[PDB]
Amino acid sequence: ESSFMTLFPKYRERYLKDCWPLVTKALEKHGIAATLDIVEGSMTVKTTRKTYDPAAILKARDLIKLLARSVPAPQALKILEDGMACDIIKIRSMVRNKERFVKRRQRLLGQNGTTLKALELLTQTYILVHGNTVSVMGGYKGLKEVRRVVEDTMNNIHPIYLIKELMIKRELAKDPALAHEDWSRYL
């Protein structure tokens, strides 16, 4: 037995109750138990002995931290795949000005989330913006790239410039003759 735990809030409680049977279903599929405490608000995941997968407990700790950060529940169950990995980028201490932080976070949001959808299509990820933090996912290369994108849009380089660079990246990566040089003349 080896246990991980954290604490979820009282607006996420109803989410976790009406949303729990699939979480415990996939985790019984991975042979690990989990229950929901309501009088305290902790999700407790307990590795059994029949756990044939050793990575499943670390994936379950990632599960419980995404459900504590109110990330969507079977996206968090999609973390149970191989190349998926979560990451959080705090930006409230990167931007020292209050209103400039708010304006830069909604500049990140863009008009109707079209820039968000373009970023997640271009990097094959999922983006959630939990105010001071941002929840991201995907393949590890995509994780590095979206961490780069969020630090540039907090340093006030515009996401339309970044989608320009990322589409030029995409095309110059899919053509094979240009396989290895320094392509900064194109960006």
Partner RNA sequence: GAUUAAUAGGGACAGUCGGGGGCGUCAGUAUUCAAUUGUCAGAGGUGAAAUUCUUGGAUUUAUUGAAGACUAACAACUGCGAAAGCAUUCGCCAAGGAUGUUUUCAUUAAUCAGGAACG
| Residues 6 or more apart whose Cβ sits within 8 Å of residue 49 | none
Please count the residues of this chain forming the interface with another protein, following the rule CB under 8 A: 21
Burial 122-134 (b: 16+ CB within 10 A, else e): bbebbbbbeeeeb
Q: Which helix (H) or strand (E) holds 19?
A: helix 13-29
Q: Which stretch binds another protein (CB under 8 A): 7-15, 121-129, 136-144, 158-166?
A: 136-144
Q: Which stretch binds another protein (CB under 8 A): 23-31, 87-95, 114-122, 156-164?
A: 87-95
Decide: is 169 part of the binding site for another protein (CB under 8 A). Answer: no
Site string for another protein, 56-75 (x = CB under 8 A): -xxx-xx-------------
Site string for RNA, 113-142 (x = CB under 7 A): ------------------xx--------x-
Phi (first) and psi of residue 169, to 5 degrees? -50, -50
